[PDB]
Design a protein around this ligand. Sequence first.
Ligand SMILES: *[C@@H]1O[C@H](CO)[C@@H](O)[C@H](O)[C@H]1NC(C)=O
Ligand SMILES: *[C@@H]1O[C@H](CO)[C@@H](O)[C@H](O)[C@H]1NC(C)=O
Ligand SMILES: *[C@@H]1O[C@H](CO)[C@@H](O)[C@H](O)[C@H]1NC(C)=O
Ligand SMILES: *[C@@H]1O[C@H](CO)[C@@H](O)[C@H](O)[C@H]1NC(C)=O
Ligand code: NI
Lengths: 555, 555
Amino acid sequence: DPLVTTNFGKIRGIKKELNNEILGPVIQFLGVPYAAPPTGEHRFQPPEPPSPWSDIRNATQFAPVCPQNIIDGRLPEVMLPVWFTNNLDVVSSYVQDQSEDCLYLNIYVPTGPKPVMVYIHGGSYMEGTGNLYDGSVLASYGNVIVITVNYRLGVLGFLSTGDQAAKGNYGLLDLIQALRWTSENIGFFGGDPLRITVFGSGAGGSCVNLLTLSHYSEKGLFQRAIAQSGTALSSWAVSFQPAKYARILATKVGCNVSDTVELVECLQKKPYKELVDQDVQPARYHIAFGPVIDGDVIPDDPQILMEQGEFLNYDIMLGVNQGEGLKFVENIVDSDDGVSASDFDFAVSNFVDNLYGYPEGKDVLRETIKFMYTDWADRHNPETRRKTLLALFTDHQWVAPAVATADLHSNFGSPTYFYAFYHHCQTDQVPAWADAAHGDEVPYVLGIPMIGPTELFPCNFSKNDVMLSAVVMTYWTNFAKTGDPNQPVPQDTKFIHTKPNRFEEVAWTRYSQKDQLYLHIGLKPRVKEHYRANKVNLWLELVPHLHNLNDHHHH
Amino acid sequence: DPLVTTNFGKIRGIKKELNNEILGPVIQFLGVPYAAPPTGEHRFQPPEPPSPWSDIRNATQFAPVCPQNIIDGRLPEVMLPVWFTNNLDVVSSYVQDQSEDCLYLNIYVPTGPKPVMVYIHGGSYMEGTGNLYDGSVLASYGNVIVITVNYRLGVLGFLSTGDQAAKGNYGLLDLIQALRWTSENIGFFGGDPLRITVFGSGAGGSCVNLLTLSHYSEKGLFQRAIAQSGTALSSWAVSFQPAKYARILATKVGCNVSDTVELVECLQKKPYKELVDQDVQPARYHIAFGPVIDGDVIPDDPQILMEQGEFLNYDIMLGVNQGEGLKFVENIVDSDDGVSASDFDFAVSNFVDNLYGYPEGKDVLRETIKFMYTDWADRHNPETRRKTLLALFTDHQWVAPAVATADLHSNFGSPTYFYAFYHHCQTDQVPAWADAAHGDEVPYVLGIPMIGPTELFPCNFSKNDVMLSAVVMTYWTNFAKTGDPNQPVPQDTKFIHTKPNRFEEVAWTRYSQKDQLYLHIGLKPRVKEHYRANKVNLWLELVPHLHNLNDHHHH
Ligand SMILES: *[C@@H]1O[C@H](CO)[C@@H](O)[C@H](O)[C@H]1NC(C)=O
Ligand SMILES: *[C@@H]1O[C@H](CO)[C@@H](O)[C@H](O)[C@H]1NC(C)=O
Ligand SMILES: *[C@@H]1O[C@H](CO)[C@@H](O)[C@H](O)[C@H]1NC(C)=O
Ligand SMILES: *[C@@H]1O[C@H](CO)[C@@H](O)[C@H](O)[C@H]1NC(C)=O
Ligand code: NI
């Protein structure tokens, strides 16, 4: 009978055996309230502490998830993890039970104080749940406590009128409240509040970075951050026109009045289902509801905050996957796995126009970008065209921003580590020609290969996948334990790996803007330098110069 | 007693043994007049046939060379072959005996009709002599007749008033006259007038290409062309402001009168040395005296003629050397063999402004070129900077023009072959870090390694140099024999090679604009595709687009 007494009352967890003969069991505390329900007058308001209870509260099953709709095709596939979009039937079972009363977290405890890794999920800020990420294997394997969190999503978590009526960022404030709850109560579970690492993939990674830029993350709250395939600098990390979308939403539900306070009060009267089901489309590659620059939680544009080093110095780990942008080209690839020269020019031109605006003069940007992403040493290959087009989207939305983020963190003294993920397990839902796509590193970080194929992750993981997952978890948990991916657990070959550990002699060197060393995570691992340096510098150095040659405007 | 009766009279040659035990001797006919002396009223006039003689004329020693000055530092080192500029003391001995009466050619005959290879020398159109190129080894080894030619140089060979007073191109007309003489008389020496191949390096290669664009090269005159490191499309292949320089020269010698006919008549009265010794400097990277677009010999801009396929369909072979542009950077390299970021920016910017003119608006060209030639994967390496800067000059002045030439020839049906020369023998006069420079292929084509170091080519040639020279001569002479570098002599290993022939299994595939297959000539030979495709397309496609973004002007 796993009982723990927290500052709010006694809680009962549940022991769970893992589907691996080597891994020990864990104790799970599911559906733990970390804040009061954000309902009634508390909708569109910062989270309040949870109410205490006098008996023993059971935490043996997941609590309802935050309101969302993932079955009507409103989800931006180019932004969400492929494992999620390709397995909607299973994902749906995890979010079938919903409620506005959804501020709960899950704790996985292995059977001195242990490091705590807090996972922040996120695809587009509109959907998901930490419940989708089983932290059992990571906890048991790395001997760390793993926590998954549910924070307010979409409209309920991010609506903002651009003024005092609704300041936005409720979902981020929930994450901060979950971190405060953890800091104050995890010791009761055997956790170390002085060694808290927050990690997340995709929009979850964006959340991680945004938290490091907020003064609400007081010194000492958490110590390290791991942002996988997600930054605060991408076009879809922040909502820059919140008021516009708040009013479009209001108009659709019959609440669009002149006064913003009355508008919000009206929205607070609506059944949450009504707000969630409306179709509010943002510009392509951008978001409608999400983090906003309120001047308080998020003090200014993240780019400015980063350039000016407006963040505490956490230990930082970040990276990207070889082929993040799969969904960007998957639909235009012909039956021969190739992309035509015409589809290529069309795709590149439209992407540039949406991100940089239409030129009011003679174009130079589109012409230059098409030239740069054309393999002149093999310009006739339709498959190579597919590859370079995919690389363009990957470089622009993930690689460039990640490098810009790494450069600034190291420049300002944050111990930084960078990785490029070049491995994955292909399911029957992904093209045979595809490389690791957005979200593909998640199963490895969570140790799914160690417990075999699951409903959520059905790929038939190989022994090499198990070995690689073990390697990744060792680096990730070493980082959680010391802020150094190499300490204290060496990369050795043990029965758990099932195959020789190919990283035995690979020390993950710290990243610096000068050498830019990074870990190439794959079956042929090694530390390399200047990840895709040519394309990264094209986007960060040359393009801005060319962009300023003309006046541009959007629509 | 080597006697031959030509259409103009009997000529006596001289037998010559070669410094190689395997090679047979050759009969040399040196100083054979192929035209009448272009003196008096014949200065600045097309060449006339030579006068016949009734006795036996001796052709056992070189005739005086055409007027020139190579000792006062007026020679543009960036344009001339390195072996020439680095060994002026020896070169000077070959041009010490000069005369305006200089239209003579040299014939090398091996001891059915044999193919004839006519070598056209040329550094900047102002200096040199075919006498510098001993065709003995090529003739003996390949069993072909080799001819070297002396044509009018500099002022005497190319002065033009831009009108009828002096139409220019006298030196080119001399080459045509030498080819006509060869066509009509080489059979008397055992040569085949139906298999005449013209070849040349540097400005000599430019001459070769210009001849293919002239209507004066009537169908049947010659059948094949080999242009080594030289085209008719480079900035220094043609003189575009002839009148301007004709008048600057006239002013310097006291002949600048208003009437162009009177100006020319005055120049015709001057001692040739007076015209040769004047310092007439053209714009950097351009020429003052050289081929001009007269609308007759050269009907229009070579670029236009090439785009429109205005040339007969010859068998063509063309190529470039790995590091042509050595002299462009050699002087700015520090004692550490590197180039600073500042010197790099300065060199690139100045080169671009000279070739493209100064922009009258915000620059885009300089910024883009600097970005393209920066190795972002090793941006801190000063030696890499040296290499990329050298590559920039090489790509622009030699590679791009050669590829443009090859593409057009193949597009219009000319059987085309392309090579990249990646081997050389370093003398103690060139930097240890340098790769094959401009003119470095000459010793190999001429078989110099077979006879050991010479006064002109003092490098201590290795066994591999001998082997490679043998390989090159086989490809070149096979081309002369059949128009196909692979027939009829196979690339086998014989005692003459001294080392195993590394090209035994390397068939030189024909070049096409689609596959752009070329022969990589080096110690690790093989046919490759799309030589430096990225940089070539940058210059041929992207740059022209960026150039048109602004109005540009020169000074
Ligand atoms: C809590 O769980 C216990 C053990 O399964 C059960 O007996 C009880 O009915 C549940 N509800 C509570 C909190 O009493
Ligand atoms: C909501 O009302 C305001 C003021 O009446 C108006 O400006 C706005 O367009 C309306 N919202 C929309 C987009 O329909
Ligand atoms: C030509 O060469 C021959 C043989 O060396 C020599 O006898 C003669 O004097 C030379 N002069 C001429 C033109 O006969
Ligand atoms: C030569 O004379 C002409 C006309 O008298 C003049 O235009 C030209 O500038 C003179 N040549 C030079 C460049 O000195
Ligand atoms: Ni000017």
